[PDB]
Design a protein around this ligand. Structure first.
Ligand code: HG
Ligand code: ZN
Length: 255
């Protein structure tokens, strides 16, 4: 699988039949159809004790991994029931500033999309959460081109080190709190992973307010390689999956 024409999203259904499931992600968020649910509690993000370990190029993105052997960085409140632990974060960007996001608002697409992945700690490990309908919690944050995001530069500088697939580098003392928008207002719906296995275990929480980043910041992303070292260079761009059918699902708003 990949994002090319011969291994693109439109071919995933052959290896991952679930790609044609009933609760697939991403979806288009129709702000007029979204239903404001008053009984929705405020989001609770506690990343003050977060501990990043490394950054890795897995061939379809770059992952910032965190230490989740303890309730260091947690996500609770909101639509969620219990504690969810931060395991890793990654992005989805385009070839141009006109595309890159997996999620869209009123059919609009952003430069990129930040996804912070959390697993329901009553399941004890990550591997077991994927086996549950409420095993994961995803924080979707949209990125627009404008002013530079200061708290994102550490990441942008290390990319040269993980240019190719398989590469990794130590990445400690990184505070994810520098990547959140001002407001925690969100939309929530039942979904899945936007990459194979495409398991339908995720509880989506897409924040309303986007974070701006500079054109030179987004450009560093696009300099990454899908390919492994010593292989023909295939730039890591357009690593996003097209919106899927909501199929009866309902998208709720906290605002
Ligand atoms: Hg699941
Ligand atoms: Zn993602």
């Amino acid at each position: 699988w990949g994002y090319g024409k011969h291994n693109g999203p439109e071919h995933w259904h052959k290896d991952f039949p679930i790609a044609k499931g009933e609760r697939q992600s991403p979806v288009d968020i129709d702000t007029h159809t979204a239903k404001y649910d008053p009984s929705l509690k405020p989001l609770s993000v506690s990343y003050d004790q977060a501990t990043s370990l490394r950054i890795l190029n897995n061939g379809h993105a770059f992952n910032v991994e965190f230490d989740d052997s303890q309730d260091k960085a947690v996500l609770k409140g909101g639509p969620l029931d219990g504690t969810y632990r931060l395991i890793q974060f990654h992005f989805h960007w385009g070839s141009l500033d006109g595309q890159g996001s997996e999620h869209t608002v009123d059919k609009k697409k952003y430069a990129a999309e930040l996804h912070l992945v959390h697993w329901n700690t009553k399941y004890g490990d990550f591997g077991k959460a994927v086996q549950q309908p409420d095993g994961l919690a995803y924080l979707g944050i949209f990125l627009k081109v404008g002013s530079a995001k200061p708290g994102l530069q550490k990441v942008v500088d290390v990319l040269d080190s993980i240019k190719t697939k398989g590469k990794s580098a130590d990445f400690t003392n990184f505070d994810p709190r520098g990547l959140l928008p001002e407001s925690l207002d969100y939309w929530t719906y039942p979904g899945s992973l936007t990459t194979p296995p495409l398991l339908e275990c995720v509880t989506w929480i897409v924040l309303k307010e986007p974070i701006s980043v500079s054109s030179e910041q987004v450009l560093k992303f696009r300099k990454l390689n899908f390919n492994g070292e010593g292989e023909p260079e295939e730039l890591m761009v357009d690593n996003w999956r097209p919106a899927q059918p909501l199929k009866n699902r309902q998208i709720k708003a906290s605002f």
